[PDB]
């Protein structure tokens, strides 16, 4: 079986009222946690790689992690998605690996960390847009900076994100640049900066209306009522796993995420894809750090990763779950590639 | 590219006078360790898996992580074999998911723990060995049954290995039994026991030659010089890795494994392949355990994985060197297993 596009996933969660939660993956016992989860609830799968996910498991191995994965679930779609990609070339460089959606990230310079101009944003976007869209890849963009309102801090995904103090006005997208940003791209999904930001300290306490935007989500789903939203930085960092980290030799201070029920309320204004990585690594950590302590003979890693597995697994179930996600994979009829871009010629999905 | 049989390596380091380590595999992290290591010094791979890999990482993720390791590394033969197995209709299904070579373990009955009669075992094997070499595909046979030779004891590998205590008899096995098994079946590569056993409670003290019979090796070499011989169960145990880990908050005991300077002895007398997996597990066990005890705060699971990648490959890399492969590789021209059917109709592999 193939892959599907981002696109048709997405326009079936806009229709059926949910958002996919889109799994970071760098090895197998994540893409077994995922696809298990997802099988178990029979819904759609987003997963997604970085750069740095390339440079630590290579790009033969993810491909093929991903190929296995629809081979042993033939019944559950796949997106095979690639994350905060720096440049045009790169994106192309993804079609070619086998990638079925590209997000090209103009909002940041090729280096991952220098906030770009308007123009250059579009002109990449647009760019990936032209010829992914030929070969039915999806594409999402990005207008605004992501961030922490009150502190000026990115966070760095896997080296990306932005170098030096924001301001309030690159951390906060403006209803009408993400009009300008979709009139000018024709992006498949939009991601938008609301004061999320990468990794486990994204608010020091739990975060309110001024430091979370979502008013800001539904002022832009209300000016563009048919665009698919994209939440980055949305892991929700468990305290339960902060927990176990720090009884088992770990050390994570005080630090909170993006709370689950604010992002359901993102999903009924228009948010359908999550971005969830750091929570995956959390729930890793702590199973990791608990079953070494209470086991010291035991060498087999299968033990503890095994763990790993579970714990991830349980954290996907939660969010497909609370998304809305649980059986929409039995209603989906996947539409190939070269049908995408087909409709895509004939203006269809403009 | 496509995998090369087992067979054709083994000839080739018969004819070199080399021995190829054989290591198991059961994700990602494992088999970047093992393809690393053998790019670096540019020699073959034999890889393997159990009944308990495919159950842990599934099927098709095994099958796809060979895949991707010819894909990356084009230039490095690989073989994937499958460890114990414990019927014909399991070495059928091996070849159907496209393993190069098997191993009936024709030793143990299909529980993989009682040990079989002479006649069973030649039946299971023969079996195999007619429906493999019409496929070109590879097979090893064992003679004897692994356990130490002291406590009749065999340990367990993936849930394979005698249950209850053994003779003498059982665990050594007599230049004739090998002899007239060799005759009878038609194995590629002979699996004996001459005490060693699985895991990494081999030995309390430091092996002698009464109890790991080296000598035994040299005997069924010169009964049977034209024969590949399999020394399984011969990870060696790396002290210093012992020593990481019961400082990091493990405890395994004293004990020791299979010497390379014996196993180097084994090889100058026709031990071909060495399947070394334990080693591994110790090695992937003390880089996690230190590193999350130096590194409280970091919870991303490639940090800590990838000592365990380098610390793999370093006993990788210590095998390949000291077993004679250095620059092999480079010497070998790839027989395509039809080709190899070909050859075993013709009887020039008999």
């Known amino acids: 079986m193939a892959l599907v596009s981002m696109r048709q996933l997405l326009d079936h969660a806009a229709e059926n009222s949910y958002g996919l939660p889109a799994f970071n993956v760098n090895n197998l016992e994540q893409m077994r946690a995922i696809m298990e989860a997802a099988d178990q609830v029979n819904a759609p799968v987003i997963v997604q790689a970085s750069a740095g996910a390339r440079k630590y498991a290579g790009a033969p191995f993810l491909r093929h992690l991903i190929l ?83 502190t000026g801090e990115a966070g760095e995904e896997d080296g990306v994100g932005a170098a030096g103090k924001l301001s309030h006005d690159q951390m906060l997208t403006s209803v009408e640049d993400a009009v300008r940003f979709v009139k000018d791209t024709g992006v498949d999904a939009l991601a938008i900066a609301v004061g999320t930001s990468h990794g486990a300290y994204k608010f020091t306490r739990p975060p309110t209306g001024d430091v979370l935007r979502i008013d800001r989500i539904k002022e832009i789903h209300q000016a563009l009522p048919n665009t698919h939203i994209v939440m980055h930085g949305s892991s929700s960092v468990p305290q339960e796993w902060l927990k176990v980290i720090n009884e088992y030799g770990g050390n994570i201070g005080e630090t909170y995420g993006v709370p689950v029920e604010e992002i359901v309320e993102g999903i009924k204004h228009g948010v359908r894809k999550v971005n969830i990585d750091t929570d995956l690594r959390l729930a890793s950590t702590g199973a990791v750090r608990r079953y070494l302590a209470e086991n010291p003979s035991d060498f087999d890693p299968r033990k503890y990763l095994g763990k790993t597995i579970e714990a991830m697994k349980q954290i996907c179930l939660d969010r497909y779950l609370a998304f809305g996600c649980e059986g929409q994979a039995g209603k989906i009829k996947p539409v190939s590639l070269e049908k995408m871009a087909s409709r895509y010629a004939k203006g269809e999905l403009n």
């Open 68 to 150: 296995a994965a629809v081979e042993e679930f033939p019944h559950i779609p796949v997106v095979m998605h690639q994350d905060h990609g720096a440049s045009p070339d790169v994106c192309q460089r993804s079609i070619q690996l086998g990638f079925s959606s590209v997000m090209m990230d103009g909002s940041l310079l090729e280096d991952g960390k220098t906030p770009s101009s308007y123009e250059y944003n579009v002109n990449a976007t647009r760019t990936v847009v032209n010829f992914s869209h030929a070969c039915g890849v999806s594409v999402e963009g990005e207008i605004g900076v992501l961030g922490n309102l009150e």
